Design a protein around this ligand. Structure first.
Ligand SMILES: NC(=O)c1ccc[n+]([C@@H]2O[C@H](COP(=O)([O-])OP(=O)(O)OC[C@H]3O[C@@H](n4cnc5c(N)ncnc54)[C@H](O)[C@@H]3O)[C@@H](O)[C@H]2O)c1
Ligand SMILES: NC(=O)c1ccc[n+]([C@@H]2O[C@H](COP(=O)([O-])OP(=O)(O)OC[C@H]3O[C@@H](n4cnc5c(N)ncnc54)[C@H](O)[C@@H]3O)[C@@H](O)[C@H]2O)c1
Ligand SMILES: NC(=O)c1ccc[n+]([C@@H]2O[C@H](COP(=O)([O-])OP(=O)(O)OC[C@H]3O[C@@H](n4cnc5c(N)ncnc54)[C@H](O)[C@@H]3O)[C@@H](O)[C@H]2O)c1
Ligand SMILES: NC(=O)c1ccc[n+]([C@@H]2O[C@H](COP(=O)([O-])OP(=O)(O)OC[C@H]3O[C@@H](n4cnc5c(N)ncnc54)[C@H](O)[C@@H]3O)[C@@H](O)[C@H]2O)c1
Ligand SMILES: Nc1ncnc2[nH]cnc12
Ligand SMILES: Nc1ncnc2[nH]cnc12
Ligand SMILES: [K+]
Ligand SMILES: [K+]
Ligand SMILES: [K+]
Ligand SMILES: [K+]
Lengths: 461, 461, 460, 461
């Protein structure tokens, strides 16, 4: 009689299990780790708080951690990203999970709290796995005593790493962390190619709009913006790219994109006069990818072409001034996570009004909100890194170390390149790719071991 | 009465000057450096030994250094890469240059020595600009006393940087260097997009082969191999990629390439039996991009499809076992830098034999050997970095330090990210791109200064 | 009003919301609605319609109605209905018999409910068909009804083939317009529609990464061309099979390796003829041919473990699914997604690794596992349908003297001038601006400034 | 003692022959016709006037017609399209050819005349092969008596076909013609894919400009415009497309291009006010592809961005108003077939003026003028069709019919689909493609013969 969970519909469990069994065949690096370490049980004694999108892919990560000996308590890190059949299958396996698609903000907080508390008292957690830093933030602000027992944080995504680095800079980070994002088999796989697969996927499921021949503006051209621009361009959109980083803008130009600013001369003075109204009046689709605040602002929303689609694929919804739209314009739900925003006014709308925007996932991460996020074979790389980072920090046992040794180890680190390569090798074999072996003379010639690592730590790929 | 040069044909100078004037309009970063620094003359007193392909683009580099106060003596770093109209225009401007297309190895060594020796004695050089490390090697081995007076080396390319780091670890490097290669506006501009532009260019000029629908094998998937693979795929080739680095192989898979090895199970035991004969007998074009030795070896060459094209776009011709082909097979020159290599024997050939390979540029860098290398607007980035690096090491005056101080200063460094971004900004403006400026609130939100730098040094782009 | 059968009438409001959006995506269709509503050119038309009951078909239906027609509608595929579209049409008072997931028997029942009203043949006088099933039932089972019918407007390649065989045999009883071969249909819908919707359906069904994986597309006509591009743009390594060497030449020039599932291309019915090495490397096979058994039993036995199998041609007999029902065990993953266990027929190991994934039980995959073509592409096809319906209805074939009937009993396409007028409205929908020839320029190339701009021989 | 030719340099013949031998291995359909028909000499007694770009590819066509029994007298159909080594190799083989790169207009006419006249009298020609209709026109206008002996014309290109169809409409065409252009293995191969290969090739050879990230305007989107647009887009240009045909414009939208007009509201009223100045002011490259007159007019040239490249890949140079530019602006030759046009006036130019355009090949066919036109493997399809068309008409012997029978036989027709398919099969096999054979049951199912043809004649591919 297991009841230590909360999900939308437990009867979806059999369906979730069927898709988990498929996903395992799409995840050779993660499953290779499961088979490699199952006998050693390197996570025996680990008690992991996890906060990441409760998808089928996260399901395979959860069961790998458990198979290596960990206990876990799990929530999603976004209100719309849970796949309810994934959550059901995890709960039906006797694993505490608190997640459903379509949580309210209040419910989202409650779900994180259900992982932190067991039977009304703080759980004796000793490890954290996080995506975006929400669970990390709640622990440091509301449950600081628990961090006295926690050996480390393994953080999934660019935004959460930024939050960790700010805490470290400020002296407020209480436990060490591994930046899982900046493994090459994560950042340059998940962040870029994941969004390539899943951005156009989400726009199609939400609107079924033809994309070919239409105009797109992508705000940002980091890993997520590069992959997002590709997602649209490969469908035949005419893509323009905005950037504040001239190196990233240089890449956009060389990649065949016109680089433009929403603001005249690139200068936002906060008034409508600084908006490039002619440019925005021609845009059919705007996608924010920055990790920054208010990069699709109210004046931009006022100027967009009628019936433009607006969405965000960065971690948080404040990339888009949705608060402005809630205050001033009338929202018509088309179907879950698809809203028409009628720019004619606040109090009601004409069902046949033509002056509206279409907002996807209420500005939340659109690939997870309106589709299923990244595919299993991409998340394979990210979640193999997650498992290796959990093992490394749990084995280090930071919480047990004397104070002077803790001080040596209070940092935010990445996994060694050798492990990055071993993850990548299993991914390549999943495609049937064959990696060539250096001869001894060739390895000597370029100064590497036949076994790698093959690049210096400075290398950017 | 200027005679301090050696070029193919001085009457080509007018043509070269016409193309330099065009190249100037395509190189806004370099020309902005001219405008900003000409009055300050930051290279007054600099005496630069330069060794880099004597192209039109290098001409704009040379005249920028001169305009900023330097004296130079120049040679090419490859026997086939000079553009004779560029060499003549430089010589006609009264600048010492020793370079022509189609040098012999002996003539190549002689041309570097004419830069080192003025009127039969060592020139009082104090700066070095190099591409591949050949001039750097000759100074260290044959003219070590000249390095006592030299403040620095600015090294252009990956292979050259590797040779500098080898000297550094072995204690044999005598002066500090700036690794120009690893600016992002160099490595992820020049090395990649430059080869994208110029690889298919050179193959068309040399053979005029249709590439669409034919089978290519690219050896390597670093920056050069990435750009080379794109060069061929965008023409419609079916491109397969070989790699020893699993992370680079993972990128090739995700980029939509099949990853294969010339060797059964990737195991290169040196026998004919290890060659995947079925694979190589399907290949119409093989391109080496590795910076490594013998990656298109004798047994691969024996197995290639009849009439396959063989070429190299890494720095040195030993990527391909051309020595084996010289010893065993008969060479028929089609035209300069295009040879049919008849696998029927050494003593002569049937003019209508069908069993031959086509080798481009005798295995030397094919984009420079059979076309004109990278275009001006791409080399703008590389050569703006070269000029900033020359100013930086010349201002630092390493040669004037005491022995104790030199030891603490001897290093291989990259330019700071702020300068990398400033180069990028000028390139983007050259495309008409408009970079957005952060608001103060946005800059505070992501933790950067509004003027940049916008990324931590760990960032890979 | 009860003259309908849909899955769930309460989905009507949602369907109406999506119709209002689709109208903004269909400028050609809505321009026709606006130009002709006053003249009511379809007043008196009674149209039997058999085509995928999607949101896009809904806008087509309501354009016909807005021009004066009455209609009775069914879907031409058991899996292609969008239930919210069908509910919206039924809620508008329009007879529609269609839901997602019909059995074959329900499929036939639905078409019969359009043909019969109150248990006797409806007084139909026009037909709109997609694939020829409704056309075939009328000729075989209700030939008297064709006495009153002025024509058929047929949507798709397979349906046109069937019309041309009847005309050659002398069994076609009413004239037809081949809507498929308008350029704004064939070279828009058949190609770019599959480009948009094939990778869409495979992602919805499996959520598989496609980049880096190996695909085999069988056929390189308009659907194979668009299908190949749908996969290649995702980063698949796509190989193409063809029996037509001209289409094969295009596949080569477009950057694809052209291969055959059979050694030297010879399909002699033996396992020995299968290129097992080739098929053992394929992660995805898509059939696009309109032919029979082009992914046969022996190919299915030879495919790489866990390969995805689907069909985007009109009919499911492109794949030998009957063989798979007879011999292997089907595990439903979710609706229209089945694991087919090649370990035997009775039962399966839930952790078996030797299975295929079949999408939509071999039926049209873009419609079965996603929503088919997007509104802005279907705008072109369905504007041609409206013009074709108008033309044949105005011609009044069933009312002509027999000598006039004999002169008009044929299968035709719409004139090129109308094809250009549909395209112009599509281009304006993108914000494109077409340039007007000057008089000197028109004279130089020998066209009217108004068009048509190409001879009828032109292939685009 | 063979002197019946005129070429630039007969000593280039050995080089021409090496390239011909390579070309033969790239042209399997054409070489297969040599083998299939050599024994039967189907062209014995044929005397062919040939007028088509005197390239290496035309050399293989010429020697195929001779290998099947024909005599020929040849000229080029453009003043810049000849490869002088091809012309030399043909002359040295004893074949009358009159063609060199860089002819004047007067020399161009003289060369056609030398094919028509032998020893000062009309040659006893009985077949015509033409590219663009210039030879056809001269025959009909100046030598009409010769057409009483000619069995037919085989015309290569769209513009020539239009000129034939005009004559047929007016009743002035004197002999029947094969429209070679409209074989699928010609129009959808040569016109489209040939320009894909060779347009960016010629722009690189002429300017060495980076194309990635720059703005192009392509006028026309028929077969040449489709292939030209792809040539630029695949290099990373941002390509805009103009059309007068809404169906073709629809295809450009769906192919991912923005469709624009040089004129406001698309209305070309001949004034400067009609020009979309903001559009033209941002274009780096304009390419005319139409076969129409003055589609890049004087007001467009005045409005173009400084230093834009201007070129034409349609058959005739009047697509561009170069006459306006000769009459008003100063031309500066960069190198052969590359001119800077200084918009500062007619009376000289400043060597450092920035207000110029770059014109390639003086407005003539840019792929043939600045590079080598289409590659051998593409011209294989076109010229295999030419050979079959020559046999077809020659074996039908129109010139021997009475006038009343000629009238019924006079037509402009395409080759039957069966021959088109047979050419295509040979092209596919040259790539190593394997075509599948229908079973009897499948052939019956779709209503075709196992041997084909596989499509109705209405099919558009
Ligand atoms: N939805 C997903 O599946 C997914 C996956 C990975 C990461 N993410 C999230 O996406 C966001 C971006 O991640 P990333 O890895 O690409 O980070 P990144 O740093 O590589 O890229 C962000 C880019 O935004 C640019 N930018 C910032 N402010 C801008 C502005 N005002 N205008 C234009 N450009 C601006 C920056 O210059 C930078 O290049 C983060 O929130 C990250 O956590 C989402
Ligand atoms: N021609 C040009 O214009 C040009 C431009 C820049 C650099 N280069 C030269 O190109 C070479 C490569 O430069 P880079 O910047 O790409 O270096 P890189 O280190 O980024 O890439 C070289 C790649 O080769 C791979 N490799 C090594 N041995 C291999 C083998 N046996 N088989 C397969 N792959 C193997 C490595 O794993 C690596 O990824 C260097 O010589 C560099 O100087 C040439
Ligand atoms: N799903 C959709 O939305 C959609 C859209 C339009 C048409 N269709 C259907 O798709 C099918 C194809 O339509 P089309 O317009 O592309 O037809 P098409 O005639 O243009 O193409 C079919 C191609 O298949 C090839 N082929 C035939 N038998 C083959 C075999 N055994 N192996 C390999 N290739 C073979 C033919 O040579 C031909 O080129 C028809 O059934 C049509 O009605 C589906
Ligand atoms: N250079 C080459 O190698 C090569 C190869 C084949 C053909 N050609 C020549 O190229 C030209 C085009 O041939 P094609 O086969 O593409 O013909 P096409 O009829 O298929 O296409 C020309 C297109 O130009 C469009 N057009 C006409 N006037 C226009 C205007 N004012 N503005 C915009 N678009 C306009 C027409 O609508 C048409 O679609 C002809 O002269 C042909 O002989 C050149
Ligand atoms: N499918 C997925 N599961 C978990 N985290 C993700 N981030 C992006 N896609 C994801
Ligand atoms: N055009 C060029 N000039 C100088 N060095 C180069 N390296 C690559 N291309 C080059
Ligand atoms: K997923
Ligand atoms: K160059
Ligand atoms: K749809
Ligand atoms: K050529």
């Amino acid at each position: 009689g297991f009841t230590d969970y909360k999900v939308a519909d437990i009867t979806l469990a059999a369906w979730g299990r069927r898709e988990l069994i498929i996903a395992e065949s799409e995840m050779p690096a993660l499953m290779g780790l499961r088979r490699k370490y199952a006998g050693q049980q390197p996570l025996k004694g680990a008690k992991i708080l996890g906060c990441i999108h409760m998808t089928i892919q996260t399901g395979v990560l959860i069961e790998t951690l458990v198979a290596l000996g960990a206990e876990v308590r799990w929530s999603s890190c976004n209100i719309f990203s849970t796949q309810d059949q994934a959550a059901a299958a995890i709960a039906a396996a006797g694993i505490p999970v608190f997640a459903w698609k379509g949580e309210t903000e209040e419910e989202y907080e409650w779900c994180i709290e259900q992982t932190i508390l067991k039977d009304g008292q703080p759980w004796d957690a000793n490890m954290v796995l996080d995506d975006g830093g929400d669970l990390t933030e709640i622990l440091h602000k509301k449950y600081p005593q628990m961090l006295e027992r926690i050996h480390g944080i393994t953080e999934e995504t660019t935004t959460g790493v930024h939050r960790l680095l700010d805490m470290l800079k400020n002296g407020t980070l209480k436990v060490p962390a591994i930046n899982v994002n900046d493994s090459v088999t994560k950042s340059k796989n998940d962040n870029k190619y994941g969004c390539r697969h899943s951005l156009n996927d989400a726009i199609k499921r939400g609107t079924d709009h033809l994309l070919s021949g239409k105009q797109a503006l992508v705000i940002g051209y980091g890993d997520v913006g590069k992959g997002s621009s590709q997602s649209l361009r490969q469908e035949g959109m005419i893509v323009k790219v905005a950037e504040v980083d001239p190196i990233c803008a240089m890449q956009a130009c060389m990649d065949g994109f016109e680089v433009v600013s929403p603001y005249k001369n690139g200068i936002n003075d906060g008034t409508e006069a600084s908006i490039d109204a002619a440019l925005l009046g021609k845009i059919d689709l705007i996608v924010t990818t920055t990790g920054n605040v208010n990069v699709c602002d109210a004046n931009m929303l006022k100027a967009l072409k009628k019936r433009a689609v607006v969405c965000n694929i960065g971690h948080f919804d404040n990339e888009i001034d949705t608060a402005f739209m809630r205050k001033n314009w009338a929202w018509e739900e088309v179907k879950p996570q698809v809203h028409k925003i009628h720019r004619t006014g606040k109090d009601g709308f004409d069902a046949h009004n033509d002056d509206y925007l279409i907002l996807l996932a209420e500005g939340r991460l659109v690939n997870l909100g309106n589709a299923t996020g990244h595919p299993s074979r991409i998340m394979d790389g990210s979640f193999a890194n997650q498992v290796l980072a959990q093992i490394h920090l749990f084995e280090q046992k930071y919480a047990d170390l004397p104070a002077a040794e803790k001080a040596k180890r209070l940092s935010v680190e990445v996994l060694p390149k050798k492990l990055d390569e071993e993850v990548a090798l299993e991914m390549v074999k999943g495609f049937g790719g064959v990696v060539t072996q250096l001869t001894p003379k060739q390895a000597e010639y370029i100064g590497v071991s036949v076994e790698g690592p093959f690049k210096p730590d400075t290398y950017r790929y």
